[PDB]
Design an enzyme around this catalytic site. Structure first.
Site, short mmCIF file in Angstrom:
data_model
loop_
_atom_site.label_atom_id
_atom_site.label_comp_id
_atom_site.label_asym_id
_atom_site.label_seq_id
_atom_site.Cartn_x
_atom_site.Cartn_y
_atom_site.Cartn_z
N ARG A 45 0.79 -1.14 0.11
CA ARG A 45 -0.11 0.04 0.07
C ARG A 45 1.00 1.18 0.04
O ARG A 45 2.00 1.05 0.53
CB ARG A 45 -0.88 -0.03 1.14
CG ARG A 45 -0.12 0.09 2.56
CD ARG A 45 -0.04 -1.58 3.33
NE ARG A 45 -1.01 -1.60 3.91
CZ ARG A 45 -1.43 -1.55 5.30
NH1 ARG A 45 -0.53 -0.74 5.96
NH2 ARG A 45 -2.34 -1.84 6.15
N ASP A 154 9.93 12.24 -9.08
CA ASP A 154 9.73 11.09 -7.66
C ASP A 154 10.87 10.05 -7.84
O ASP A 154 10.50 9.05 -7.62
CB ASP A 154 8.27 10.73 -7.53
CG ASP A 154 8.06 10.10 -6.24
OD1 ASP A 154 8.67 10.62 -5.20
OD2 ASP A 154 7.22 9.11 -6.10
C1 LIG Z 1 6.78 -3.52 -2.13
C2 LIG Z 1 7.84 -4.67 -2.93
C3 LIG Z 1 9.15 -4.19 -3.03
C4 LIG Z 1 7.75 -5.76 -1.72
O1 LIG Z 1 7.12 -5.36 -3.87
C5 LIG Z 1 7.57 -5.04 -5.30
O2 LIG Z 1 8.82 -5.25 -5.63
N1 LIG Z 1 6.72 -4.56 -5.78
C6 LIG Z 1 5.48 -3.38 -5.34
C7 LIG Z 1 6.00 -2.12 -5.23
O3 LIG Z 1 5.12 -1.41 -4.08
C8 LIG Z 1 4.77 -0.23 -4.67
C9 LIG Z 1 3.58 0.24 -3.75
O4 LIG Z 1 4.12 0.40 -2.19
C10 LIG Z 1 6.47 -4.78 -7.16
C11 LIG Z 1 6.76 -6.02 -7.67
C12 LIG Z 1 6.58 -6.47 -9.13
N2 LIG Z 1 6.28 -5.48 -9.81
N3 LIG Z 1 6.08 -5.58 -11.16
C13 LIG Z 1 5.73 -4.38 -11.63
C14 LIG Z 1 5.75 -3.53 -10.49
C15 LIG Z 1 5.04 -1.96 -10.61
C16 LIG Z 1 4.61 -1.56 -11.84
C17 LIG Z 1 3.79 -0.36 -11.80
C18 LIG Z 1 3.77 0.36 -10.60
C19 LIG Z 1 3.46 1.84 -10.91
O5 LIG Z 1 3.30 2.59 -9.77
O6 LIG Z 1 2.99 2.31 -11.85
C20 LIG Z 1 4.11 -0.25 -9.46
O7 LIG Z 1 3.88 0.67 -8.34
C21 LIG Z 1 4.71 -1.42 -9.22
C22 LIG Z 1 5.84 -4.20 -9.56
N4 LIG Z 1 5.87 -4.10 -7.91
#
Ligand SMILES: CC(C)(C)OC(=O)N(CCOCCO)c1ccn2ncc(-c3ccc(C(=O)O)c(O)c3)c2n1
EC number: 2.7.11.1
Length: 331
Positions: A45, A154
């Site tokens: 979130r 950002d």
């Molecule tokens: C949090 C943690 C680092 C554990 O998780 C992750 O590594 N996260 C979420 C990032 O959190 C964001 C919120 O707080 C992953 C994982 C895989 N993927 N693939 C695409 C994405 C992706 C693509 C586009 C957006 C955008 O904002 O336009 C976006 O927010 C995210 C992604 N985000």
């Protein structure tokens, strides 16, 4: 009042586009079918959204769904328009779809899935070469978006997805991004505290793409020096003090004079008098393997008060820091 400012590069890129390109308030949002996606697991979130891994039931493709928290129509339209304008550019996240989330009654953005390693774990494992390589990949995204008339506003680790196995990087979170129009007075209340440029902190509104280059310099410092954040302010005022303790107060006051900036009266007492510090002050046994003359010269040329003095994305890509990486990518 303050002296006006123009971008050094890509100054009039939007002026020559059709109105529709940059006039996001007029954009009519193209909705897809929400029933094409099933949510799989929550990833996190934010203040502005909640993010899930999902699946497109038709294609059986993994995707990421960002369910927008309530913000003005114009803010959603801006992010959509920018993502659409930039789609397919180097290392820009791909917007696959826009759907109406039925429970929320808010839009959901559907993105390509990146197999990201959380920066909190990844950044410690990165070699000297890895930092150079991924910095170059971020610069390709920034030169592209800047060349397309868009400021990210950002840039930070959270917003850089890295699939390490595939040496793949994507710049995400275009929710704060804006089109550059010469002479426009922007909102200074943008970006994350530790990465805010001096222009924001002194309330200089006529800023440009160069803001992103300060944020990038903050990232580079945090990586090479193993110091997250690099500039650790307590508040917005103390943030400028933290910067001034490193860059020095003489150059700060020179910048304020050059642009005839009216300094908030709160600032005076806390700002004091500080020498410009040598970068070698921040080198130690834990980080020395990451730090070179090249790295410090490059960092010095990003982290400048005067937005006009900072390297462009395009200039930065020519720095000696990257010679090894450029050679290895034409292999
Ligand atoms: C949090 C943690 C680092 C554990 O998780 C992750 O590594 N996260 C979420 C990032 O959190 C964001 C919120 O707080 C992953 C994982 C895989 N993927 N693939 C695409 C994405 C992706 C693509 C586009 C957006 C955008 O904002 O336009 C976006 O927010 C995210 C992604 N985000």
């Amino acid at each position: 009042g303050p002296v006006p400012s123009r971008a050094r590069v890509y100054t009039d890129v939007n002026t020559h586009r059709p109105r529709e390109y940059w006039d996001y308030e007029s954009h009519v949002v193209e909705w897809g079918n929400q029933d094409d996606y099933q949510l799989v697991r929550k990833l996190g979130r934010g203040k502005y959204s909640e993010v899930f891994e999902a699946i497109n039931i038709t294609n059986n493709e993994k995707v990421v769904v960002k369910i927008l928290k309530p913000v003005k129509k114009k803010k959603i339209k801006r992010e959509i328009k920018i993502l659409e304008n930039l789609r397919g550019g180097p290392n820009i996240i791909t917007l696959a779809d826009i759907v109406k989330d039925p429970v929320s009654r808010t839009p959901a953005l559907v993105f390509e899935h990146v197999n990201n390693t959380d920066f909190k774990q990844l950044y410690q494992t990165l070699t000297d070469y890895d930092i150079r390589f991924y910095m170059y990949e971020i610069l390709k995204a920034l030169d592209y978006c800047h060349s397309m008339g868009i400021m990210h506003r950002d840039v930070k680790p959270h917003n850089v997805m890295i699939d390490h196995e595939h040496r793949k990087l994507r710049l995400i979170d275009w929710g704060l991004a804006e089109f550059y129009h010469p002479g426009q007075e922007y909102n200074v209340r943008v970006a994350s505290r530790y990465f805010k440029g001096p222009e924001l902190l002194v309330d200089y509104q006529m800023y440009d793409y160069s803001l992103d280059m300060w944020s990038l310099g903050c990232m580079l410092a945090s990586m090479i020096f193993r110091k997250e954040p690099f500039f650790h302010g307590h508040d917005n005022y103390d943030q400028l003090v933290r910067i001034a303790k490193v860059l020095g107060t003489e150059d700060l006051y020179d910048y304020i004079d050059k642009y005839n900036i009216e300094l908030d009266p709160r600032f005076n007492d806390i700002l004091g008098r500080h020498s410009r510090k040598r970068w070698e002050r921040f080198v130690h046994s834990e980080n020395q393997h990451l730090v070179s003359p090249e790295a410090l010269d490059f960092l010095d040329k990003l982290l400048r008060y005067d937005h006009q003095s900072r390297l462009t994305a395009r200039e930065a890509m020519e720095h000696p820091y990257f010679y090894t990486v450029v050679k290895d990518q034409a292999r």
